Design a protein around this ligand. Structure first.
Ligand SMILES: CC(=O)N[C@@H]1[C@@H](O)[C@H](O[C@@H]2O[C@H](CO)[C@H](O)[C@H](O)[C@H]2O)[C@@H](CO)O[C@@H]1O
Ligand SMILES: CC(=O)N[C@@H]1[C@@H](O)[C@H](O[C@@H]2O[C@H](CO)[C@H](O)[C@H](O)[C@H]2O)[C@@H](CO)O[C@@H]1O
Ligand SMILES: CC(=O)N[C@@H]1[C@@H](O)[C@H](O[C@@H]2O[C@H](CO)[C@H](O)[C@H](O)[C@H]2O)[C@@H](CO)O[C@@H]1O
Ligand code: NI
Lengths: 136, 136, 136
């Protein structure tokens, strides 16, 4: 499974909309500090998924231009991402929010801050992981 | 090869057209009963590929709203899908029909019933299989 | 990793544009002679990537209708493709050229000959390889 280049940046033609799903799989590097998945719109980051091993947390936020909003860190269970372990992320878009699952199990919801879904037409993946697959 | 969520539903931007191909791979579960692949248009199922292990057959049909048409079950050879065995499905769209191959070998043709190809813009996969990859 | 059909032909909706990337992975057959990757526009081959084991070279060219232009064969290092060995090709599109990397390492640049990027909307892969994945 040859890896994707990192960072990986690709446009999501048509943008987002209810029932739209973005899937990603790969492996967290052995000594990973952090890695992220961004759903961007022009110059803004509509959704920022930032798992942090240095902080043992999963940070989610939105950046408008140069401004980060208020972070959301709550998790229903233990940090699902593990160093050196393969993973899969399923981002499902709904009308009111994004639903994120990790390794087949729902993890959290993120209410839209940028609601013009069609304008969220760019995916960026970077950080300490080996990206092996993307389904947009 | 992390699996896709099931059922898997994704839009085929631009719909179908001659030379358009949809590829899928995965593994039939050990005790699979049935699984299907649908090419949908709005509220209709333009093409329904339904391999059945309980009946040992490969059923193809079209549903307009709530009405299933006349089923097509003929096969040139033995049922290619096997429980617990990996497979690949290649659906090639032509002007007059869809040509389906399984594991690299042509299996059957399905003449279009819904001929407005561009309107066939949705793919649904469900049933007793582990879906590992899709190329639309 | 079930293989893709060969030759593999798929449309690149929206065509090319700066920052657009096409990724491919697969395995060169044991006794491969040659294989190619084409970025086409209507009836022209905007970009032709033709690794040749019989000549031990990597040929790049453009075909307008029935006319092949002047070939580019220069390589900064040894032929990266090896018979029976897996590989990955990353084609990055920029405003002035295409940047090609093989197995994660930049290999060469190809200045655009057909500059109407959006019109380069078709990918063709053929020849002596087992194509296991494409990301357009
Ligand atoms: C607890 C807390 O508020 N800490 C924050 C850091 O999380 C924050 O780091 C940035 O966070 C954003 C997402 O909110 C991006 O991930 C960015 O890459 C991080 O640098 C810093 C900086 O804003 O502020 C506090 O330390
Ligand atoms: C031999 C025969 O005609 N049997 C049919 C069943 O195949 C049919 O089951 C449905 O078939 C459609 C496709 O034609 C869908 O797969 C659907 O999910 C099945 O339930 C039933 C019901 O229409 O009628 C006969 O039994
Ligand atoms: C050294 C040299 O000029 N040799 C060329 C061949 O490379 C060329 O072969 C064709 O090359 C084009 C790309 O330039 C395509 O790959 C095509 O499939 C090849 O047949 C031949 C024919 O034009 O001319 C010289 O021999
Ligand atoms: Ni893929």
């Amino acid at each position: 499974h040859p890896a994707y280049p990192m960072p990986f940046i690709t446009t999501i033609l048509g943008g987002l909309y209810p029932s739209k799903s973005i899937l990603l799989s790969g492996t967290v590097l052995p000594s990973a500090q952090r890695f992220h998945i961004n759903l961007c719109s022009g110059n803004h980051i509509a959704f920022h998924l930032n798992p942090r091993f240095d902080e043992n947390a999963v940070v989610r936020n939105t950046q408008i231009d140069n401004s980060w909003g208020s972070e959301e860190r709550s998790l229903p269970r233990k940090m699902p991402f593990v160093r050196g372990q393969s993973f899969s992320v399923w981002i499902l878009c709904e009308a009111h929010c994004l639903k994120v699952a990790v390794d087949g199990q729902h993890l959290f919801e993120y209410y839209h801050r940028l609601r013009n879904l069609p304008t969220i037409n760019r995916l960026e993946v970077g950080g300490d992981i080996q990206l092996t697959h993307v389904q947009t």
